[model samples]
Target: LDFPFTWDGTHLPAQIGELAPVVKVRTIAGAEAWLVSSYELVKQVLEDDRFSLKNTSDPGVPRQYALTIPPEVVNNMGNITGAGLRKAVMKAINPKAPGLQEWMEEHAAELVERMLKHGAPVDIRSMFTDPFSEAMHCQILGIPHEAAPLLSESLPIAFMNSPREIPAARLNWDRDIAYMTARLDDTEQGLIGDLAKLRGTEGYEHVSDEMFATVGVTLFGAGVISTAGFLAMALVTLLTHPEEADHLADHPELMPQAVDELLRINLSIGDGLPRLAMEDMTLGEVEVKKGELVLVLPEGANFDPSVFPDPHRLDFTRANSSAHFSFGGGSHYCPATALGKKHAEIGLRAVLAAMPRLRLAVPVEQLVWRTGFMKRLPERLPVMWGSGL
Candidate 1:
């Protein structure tokens, strides 16, 4: 298939699946490892208590990669380790999950108001992408209004491109981290400040300044880019398929179900999940040696006919539409899944509601997709709205 994306499953599965038992592939680091594409096998590897994300922190573990930030910083990233962080993050986002609806409602109205004020032919990315994400993070992290820009600027730098760009990114990341650390050290009112205050207590004392910084960095970096990019892509897809958009707009209540269908069929992230084997194991009858690297191709898994009926078709009414692994499964599943989905839903709804006559400013063929990252995204989404909604 000459689709916009292709995973190794189509190419290597036939050869390695039978002949080699477990075929070794070269990674970006020039290291060789086994590739597992079978859903059952990948699920086993992800859920088995034997395998460990702790490898990420181990210095001497050849199979494990070192943390990108210093150990001091990595320690605070405890939230990424287990269910506790997920709960904390979600609670931080909304003490009540239903509050997400309220948050989205408020932001949606703001987005519409802004769009109307600016009129049509707006750069949706800047007008919506930056501000929406900034507001969401500020609300969730309990960061003071004055500090949002500092956090926002630090995010792009902390998660930048290529090894050549890392030094500069790290410099900015450190500056942001230092400022955050200093603030966290001072008070006990906000999220970081409150967490800092709790650090000296019995069970919570292990929570460190670095951990606070890590949570802030991860939430801002992962939340903004992925949500913004997906929102842009969804807008493009809807504009190109006006009939589908019209159906969605008509039945506003169906937005929840429709969002899942849209995600399954037109998902942007495709690089696959990266992991390392903890010990020698057989994944779907293929022998994987200990200390080997693996990549789980989620996009490929998503289209697996065995799992999804009419995998490529866009059927918003499908019962199991949300089964797609746009967010990985099991323990390592993305903590921000709920928040991300809400952001996208609110964003799309706002665009459609405010600009009922919205249409693409350019032809679909002229649109360019961003490369070199796990998530596929459009360079820009230029759209025009009718004079009146």
Candidate 2:
């Protein structure tokens, strides 16, 4: 079976149910890796410390896909913690940080205003989601707004799923690092500035400049891609389910639960969450040897009927909805989970409030899904207001 199976966000391949929970498949890199597709199994592997994200990039290990960033920086968050910047990083990304929440609200509203002015059939991905995500990261990182283009210029290549390492990724990584280094020196605001001041404090003197620069570059890249992709799909989810959108619009107080349900059903993670087995283990009767790669399919886990009855149905009342692995689990769980949810919630509310009758400009089937990239989002989400195709 083709690895990175069909990009259908709503319907998963039937084989996911037919095959054993842990089954081997050939990766894009031509190496075999075990694909874990059951809710219990996916959660088991992600929560196991023996399944190492850092080791997936280790030399000679089976790879699910090529490394977009360098092998050494595979565990950037772990490195940040080791460098003693985790506290500052965490504080900076907090959705409640000063004007951060208000900024997100105003920016999303402005995007909706622009969409209204531009008329129907606007690409929501480009016009709204992408810009909102990019600007949000810039504001969080304390990087200059003017530098946003340079910061995200190479993300398309940076997040590709090619079989071999892309030379462009390295060039982009280096250039982004240089830009981040400059930002650290020239300003003492935002996360970068916070790190700069903390670095001179006791115990942080050991952190290198490379680590500092890496923090800014890696955070921005990951933040933009994740939030942009999820918001795009969230819009798709709302458009396809008019009743759900109407309910959300009328009862905005339920947004927190609604956003969790959205995250649970999101198909933005185009590929599995990869982990290299550091020790021999048995997962769902499959023997995973040391150094072998294991892929945890979030959609497989999130949509399991056993855990989520009527898995495909959108039900915000589901008590177990938050248990899904959308933001991952265990030690490697996404640090920005709160901020991500808030970003989507604010983005969705703003659009729904403005365009009550918003819908896909073209047929859902006609919208092209991106391939060979980590994110599974439409090339352009063309939407029309006051829907009447």
Candidate 3:
């Protein structure tokens, strides 16, 4: 079967249970690999050391698709810790950082204000989510807000799924890297500057300039894509379930749990978490061999009825919501988890509170979903309110 069976993000794929624990499928690259669907097995594949993310980049291995980034950068998180930049990166993305939350709120409010100006039928993805994420990244990185769009211009091409390497991906990578490299010394605030300074300090003297620039470029791309994608989709969730969203708006204290539930139900991760089997192992009924690729389907795991009863129900108070592997699992869990959750919490609160009557301008099925990319997002989230349909 083809991977990413559908671009529709509103529900889980029916293949989850039919295929059960594990099933071999054809990837975008036309290579056969085992797709793990159950919660227990997906978690097992992610946490198992024998299933290696770094080795997925190895030549001749079954690929999800051609690498948009260089093979060496596959394990960027590992490299960050190795280069002694993990704490710096974490510090840069801390939601509790002085003024960060306030800025997020202020910016979110500004976006809502603009949307209100345009009246009904506004594309919230463009008006709110994209700019919100881009601005947030700029704030965290100490880059000019104006430069965010420029960096973002490369993202569409950068994250494309293709059977062969895309030339534009490399060109954009070089240009983005150069842009970040020039900021190494010029930036005095944010993660880029911190990394530049850390490179000169004891213990971090060996961190190369390329790696430093890579950190900025990669983090910027990852942050914007992830936060924007999730926020946009979360808005869709809230818009579709107005009663619950209204309850959430009334009780802002429930936002943290609400965000967790949103994260659990999020269909943003369009592709499974890919790993190369480093050794022969039996995952469920399938015996995966060394060099085989195993895809851990988060959608499958998060929606698994065995773990989450009545899986499709959007209950904000989901106790095991945190168990969802939206951010992947084990050693490679997302570094900006707090910031991502906070971004959504602040963003959703601002939007829902401001636009209490907010709703989809068009029928849910009419919204165009993005394809041939990692994220399963609407191309445009057209929404309306205030005496509007």
| 1-389 per-residue lDDT for model 3 (tens digits) | 88869888767767666776898899999999899989999889888888998787766778998898876565454555544587778889999999999999999999988988888889999999999999999999988899889999998777777888899998898899889989997889989878878876788665678888998998899999999888887887787787888789788899999999999988888888899998899998788898998999988888888999999899999889988988888888887899999999888888877886777889999989888988888998898776532
lDDT of each: 0.61, 0.85, 0.86
Per-residue CA lDDT of candidate 1, range 1-389, in tens? Answer: 11123322112123322322234555433445455545555566667745556553454433212233555555545453434544556666552454556876787788778878887777776677667767776666656656767777655444332223245556776777777677666645435555555555665555556666666666666777677656766666677677888778767788888888777665565343566677787776577667666666555555666677666566779888787776677788777677777777777787777777677777766666554444566656677777655
Better of 2 and 3 by lDDT: 3
Sequence-dependent TM-score of model 1 = 0.81
On residues 252-361, what C-alpha lDDT tens digit does candidate 2 reach at each position?
A: 88888998998888878889899999899989788889988888899889888999888878887779889989999999999999899888889888888888677788
Clashing pairs in 3: none
Question: TM-score per candidate, in order?
Answer: 0.81, 0.95, 0.95
Q: After TM-score superposition, what is the CA distance of residue 30 in candidate 1 from its true location, in Å?
A: 3.0
| Sliding window of 10 residues with minimal summed lDDT for model 3 | 75-84
RMSD of each candidate relative to the true structure? 4.8, 2.2, 2.1
Candidate 1 lDDT (Cα, 0 to 1): 0.61
In model 3, where do residues sit more than 4 Å from their true spots?
Answer: 71-83, 200-202, 387-389
